[PDB]
Amino acid sequence: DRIIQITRGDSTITSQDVANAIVAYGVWPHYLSSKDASAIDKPSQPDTSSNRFYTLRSVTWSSSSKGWWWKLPDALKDMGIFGENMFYHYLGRSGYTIHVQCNASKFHQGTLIVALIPEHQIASALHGNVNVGYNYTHPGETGREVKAETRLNPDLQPTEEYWLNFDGTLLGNITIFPHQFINLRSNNSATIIAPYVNAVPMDSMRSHNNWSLVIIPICPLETSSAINTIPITISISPMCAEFSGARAKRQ
Amino acid sequence: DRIIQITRGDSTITSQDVANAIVAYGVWPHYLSSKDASAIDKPSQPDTSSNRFYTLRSVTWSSSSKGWWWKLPDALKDMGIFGENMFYHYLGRSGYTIHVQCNASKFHQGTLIVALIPEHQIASALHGNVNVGYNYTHPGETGREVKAETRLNPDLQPTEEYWLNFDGTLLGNITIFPHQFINLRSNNSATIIAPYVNAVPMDSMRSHNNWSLVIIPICPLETSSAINTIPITISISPMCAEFSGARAKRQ
Amino acid sequence: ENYIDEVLNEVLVVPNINSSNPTTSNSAPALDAAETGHTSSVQPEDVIETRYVQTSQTRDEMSLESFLGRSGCIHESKLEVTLANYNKENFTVWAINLQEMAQIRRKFELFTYTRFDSEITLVPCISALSQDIGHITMQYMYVPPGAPVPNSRDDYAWQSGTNASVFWQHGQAYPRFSLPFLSVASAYYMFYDGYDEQDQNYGTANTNNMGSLCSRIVTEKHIHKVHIMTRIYHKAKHVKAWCPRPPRALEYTRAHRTNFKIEDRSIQTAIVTRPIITTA
Amino acid sequence: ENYIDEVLNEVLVVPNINSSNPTTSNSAPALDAAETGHTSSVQPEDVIETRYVQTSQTRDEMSLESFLGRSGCIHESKLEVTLANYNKENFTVWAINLQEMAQIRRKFELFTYTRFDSEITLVPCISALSQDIGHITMQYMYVPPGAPVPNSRDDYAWQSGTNASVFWQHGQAYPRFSLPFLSVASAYYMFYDGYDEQDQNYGTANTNNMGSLCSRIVTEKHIHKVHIMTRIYHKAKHVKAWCPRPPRALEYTRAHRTNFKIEDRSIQTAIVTRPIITTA
Amino acid sequence: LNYFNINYFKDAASNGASKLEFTQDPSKFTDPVKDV
Amino acid sequence: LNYFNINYFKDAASNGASKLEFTQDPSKFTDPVKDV
Amino acid sequence: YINSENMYSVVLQSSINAPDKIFSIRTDVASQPLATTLIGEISSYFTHWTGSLRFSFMFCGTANTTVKLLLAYTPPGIAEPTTRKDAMLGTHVIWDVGLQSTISMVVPWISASHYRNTSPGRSTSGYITCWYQTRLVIPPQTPPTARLLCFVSGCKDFCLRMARDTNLHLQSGAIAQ
Ligand SMILES: CCOc1noc2cc(OCCC3CCN(c4ccc(C)nn4)CC3)ccc12
Ligand SMILES: CCOc1noc2cc(OCCC3CCN(c4ccc(C)nn4)CC3)ccc12
């Protein structure tokens, strides 16, 4: 009963220590209905070739790591058919199952917060008339590390202040967002299912990110073990993904 | 009643002088049934994003032109979602509506044969132990012109003998294949609908071409007009296209 | 009622010609457009005043089963028997094709795909090169893809533990046996517009690989030099075929390829030239 | 309704693949413990979203009866005929084993115990060493344990008063006959973990002793030197077997023993080496 | 009159030549007609 | 259609190949289950 | 490792933090390495191939050792996947080692034609490739390296046809009486 198996595509995920799973905002993902629709063309629904688990490049968690984030649909930009479907149409909508995985030993301790936050509009790094540049909120699968270094082009950079949720809001009220905690003594995986959420029936996969996945460790990773450094891996599967207004491929 | 309008995708074609239309082998295209199937995974059926009219680069018909051919699915290699779906899976199956278009004046005369032939395995240009090279039967949207020139790599080339149907068979028995004639005094368009046809439920879109479209003029284009040279254009729409065994993209 | 109707060979009948009358009308059945890709619908009675004739003729013989259902030679294997310790040699191997003899090849190549069970019939003949013959027994073993291929008159594979072998000895009548339709797909491919995984070997080469027919002389070392020529014959039973193609116009060059070109020879169809078109 | 269903070879069918759907649950069918000695229960539909496919395939050919029910060579007896008063010699004797020819031996050794009736088929061939052959008749007699064993082409035992003998003469077709399952126990032993009363001869040696197959040339003294090689073939009919064992991995050394070791030769399985395991 | 036929063998393929059944076109070669 | 079969001989063993009867496992190789 | 028992296990390292391949296998069943196995040897007695294959994996490491692996079957018409991304785009199972040692994944029968050849030689049935989803993590004072075992069987799906002699065994000399 701490087991979970989720099958999505041709893909199946397994975890032997999980804490339940969370369904965002209490609503399971669905295809867009006739009542709510706007775009009058027939959507394209790739089904199994699209709604499947895409797993991104892993990140490394150390004694020093103070947080990371990714943006969706962005992180999936280059992933398979979901990716290609993303730039061939104006519009798309999708829900996701997000499965974050980090394992350790009964001899390590650490705690991650895994939050999926809607319309996460982050804050500029500096004062005055700056904003954030397109490229910096569209990292692809690699995401943003919080780095103490000085950076390329700072007037365009986002704040590195993670305990401010990057948005100028207190971390630790970060809960009213769909979330789980990965706490090594207790679990191993985190799992979140989300429905499309947006004030419009379908939006641009290119110019707008509906969700941001942000994981910042609120309990620092401590061990006496030889492996004092462990990977966190993100796999996310789109669900009920549909696209419309097809044209040529945007670059 | 010589009018035709065929709508496929977001695409609609129109022709005001056509001769009926032909359905290949008397069978309309369909999706692959449970009884006939082999591959046990759920196919992906792009619907409107895939089954739509793709129109290729046009060719020029002159006093000297002795013929041309294209191969399917090959010609669609680079076309939109049908293309991309082609290399992301092992297997695919599709039917097509082929619409060949050439217009002129009541003051021109000429006659084309438009034939869609199944498993058109062409013949090597020279004698002895030659065969035809992959690249030469996979031209993409440009197709093969019959050219009287000497060619790059001749041991790998296909025959240029068009009146031999390229296969060592008499042109003019070329009829037992689904076909129409474009004859300028009479029509303007040719239209052919074909069902999947193959001795297997789905095959490799990459290594096997189910159909070849071949148009060779059996009546030479004559005019007293200033425009003594006219274009032929091919548009073809896949129909009930499905793919399975998805993996990464073959190059 | 079909033990009878096919004993005089009458199921599958040809229509009668009806009487016809002088036509005067806006209906022009003789006038169509062949541009449609459709063959004309006109019948004798449409363009000429015809009498009533009751047609007794029959299409039975024209059926796919009648046409493919006659055996013809698909391979000739000559075994020249040497005595150089006799065991190092003296075996046939043949990769199995309908493609090496033109007469049956042309017939099946009338269609794109074909499906049927096969009746193989053997006609072995011993050409005697010594004063005599003695007792010649032969073995023919079918060696499907992957089965161990015999490398010597010797080797274990003629044990034929699970393979099918058939034996012939001088004076025994022509061996025969049946095969079930063997393809891995729904039909055999007479033509293939594709290549292998390696993007090579265009054509039928890829499709039907039946493995090989292997022959050996089984009688142990002896003194008479002989040659054994076993000719292989093939009837199609239980037949369907699809997608008729035009018939091969030119001599066959090579198996599994449509190549027609030949060295220092004009390319020659079966059409025959006239002096002038106003004279037949 | 079973004259029909087995004429197209359809009794014994393979299950269909059902459609399957995205799973999210505490039920982990992919997760088991192979420590139990139990093979996993997982099916395609459990770990992947599958479509409905109606499976027409058939296990008939995979039945024990299909697999053992093909004849293959179990012995080759050569009779070199001498004329040194002709009666002192010129007979085969063979102790009867399925164990001297590897191909069928490997198959039956797939099981620990086997039971079945046998069809023995003979393929005699006369190798002519003189200018000619003449009239060769042969006799094959089954000589069960305890029956008098012939010591000369001569001796009375070919009278075959109660024994079974079968005759072949040149030009006659391949002899054949059937045997009823002959063991003294409920099944034949393919392997035996025990010895004789004397604590000797480990293995199958002890179990199945069928006695011997004895051959003689029966035609009386004559002038042509010949060799006669009669090959013995064996089909299993009416078969059951129990307790499958892993298949023989190495060449066979000796009959009735599992000994695999060979002199001055590396011990060689059929496995094939790779350079490195990250590449196939 | 008429004639006698039994199959003597266990397998489909052993059986002799098949019986004939009507041409029953459909006209799919000569007239595959989209509007008839 | 179907096919004809008679046994021409007095002894069991003379008879030809046996008929096939269902796999009907029980799962005794794959799952010999002491608590199922 | 050839004639030992070690031919039958693969070794995992705590030394590696990375998306590294561990091993790969041709998926055709009469193929090497799997020809030697029950299902292979038997398939090798027929010329025709079809069904789904069940690959089960048992983790033999310390009770306190943990890893997450990716197991992937990449269907034919493409090359053996060279990277984790490339592999994962196909049919896969992410396996989490925990109380139950074992996991079974399956390569669906996915193929052009209803049957395949047991000795294809040029054509492939696809590959199965094993990678590191995370890393092999260990406590203090426990072996740094852990082994992994691999099994095959057929599913309800599976069938063979056209019986032929086996290619995995031969008779060189004569057999002693
Ligand atoms: C112990 C006896 O074994 C045999 N002796 O002679 C034999 C002959 C055999 O083939 C049967 C007829 C087959 C030939 C294969 N063939 C094809 C297939 C594809 C193409 C493109 N062209 N021809 C289709 C029908 C099989 C076995 C034996
Ligand atoms: C006048 C003809 O007499 C015979 N000619 O050739 C013959 C062949 C005969 O054996 C029939 C098959 C038997 C062989 C004995 N065999 C076994 C038994 C145990 C083991 C461990 N391995 N093989 C089981 C089946 C019997 C009689 C004749």
Side-chain angles (χ1 to χ4, degrees), chain A residues 1 4-8 12, chain D residues 23-26 29 46-47 49:
Chain A
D1 93 84
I4 176 164
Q5 148 164 351
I6 64 227
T7 23
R8 278 308 181 262
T12 300
Chain D
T23 297
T24 326
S25 70
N26 308 81
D46 289 315
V47 290
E49 231 169 296

Side-chain angles (χ1 to χ4, degrees), chain D residues 24-127:
Chain D
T24 326
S25 70
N26 308 81
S27 196
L31 256 38
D32 211 19
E35 281 111 351
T36 44
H38 291 325
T39 302
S40 198
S41 235
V42 213
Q43 298 289 162
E45 31 239 330
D46 289 315
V47 290
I48 108 167
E49 231 169 296
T50 34
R51 79 121 113 216
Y52 188 105
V53 43
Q54 282 177 58
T55 298
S56 5
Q57 318 156 357
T58 278
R59 287 164 178 163
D60 273 347
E61 198 176 8
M62 296 198 258
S63 64
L64 235 66
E65 185 87 9
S66 183
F67 184 66
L68 278 358
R70 340 203 134 196
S71 17
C73 196
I74 59 172
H75 179 57
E76 287 166 323
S77 99
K78 71 171 164 62
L79 176 44
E80 281 161 0
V81 37
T82 341
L83 345 182
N85 275 329
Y86 196 76
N87 287 347
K88 199 200 139 220
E89 276 174 48
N90 304 337
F91 57 93
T92 304
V93 170
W94 185 55
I96 294 179
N97 306 317
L98 294 179
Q99 279 191 320
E100 298 185 4
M101 303 283 154
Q103 232 158 204
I104 62 302
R105 178 172 171 175
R106 204 174 98 134
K107 292 208 287 171
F108 292 71
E109 274 202 357
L110 276 178
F111 306 95
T112 297
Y113 307 99
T114 73
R115 181 175 143 118
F116 59 84
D117 295 318
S118 307
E119 165 191 279
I120 263 67
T121 322
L122 298 196
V123 196
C125 344
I126 334 208
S127 308

Side-chain angles (χ1 to χ4, degrees), chain B residues 71 118-122 124 128-130 133-134 137 167-169 179-181 183 186 198-199 206-209 212, chain C residues 34-37 113 185-186 189 192-195 199 202 245-249 254 256-261 263:
Chain B
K71 290 198 184 318
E119 306 304 335
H120 187 204
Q121 177 184 326
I122 46 186
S124 223
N129 212 306
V130 280
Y134 179 84
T137 55
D167 71 340
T169 196
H179 69 273
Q180 302 212 292
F181 288 91
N183 175 13
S186 280
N198 197 329
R206 175 84 198 299
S207 355
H208 181 10
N209 306 294
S212 304
Chain C
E35 281 111 351
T36 44
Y113 307 99
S186 282
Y189 283 84
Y192 200 56
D193 196 345
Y195 303 79
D199 292 274
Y202 188 53
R245 325 170 57 78
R248 175 83 173 174
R254 209 166 208 93
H256 288 284
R257 291 157 208 187
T258 30
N259 289 31
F260 61 93
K261 190 59 177 32
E263 37 271 278

Side-chain angles (χ1 to χ4, degrees), chain B residues 36-38 40 90 200 202 247 250, chain G residues 76-77 89 109-110 112-114:
Chain B
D36 281 11
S38 183
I40 83 171
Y90 170 30
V200 123
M202 317 170 75
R247 31 139 223 255
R250 166 105 193 211
Chain G
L89 286 178
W109 168 256
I110 121 87
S113 46
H114 294 252

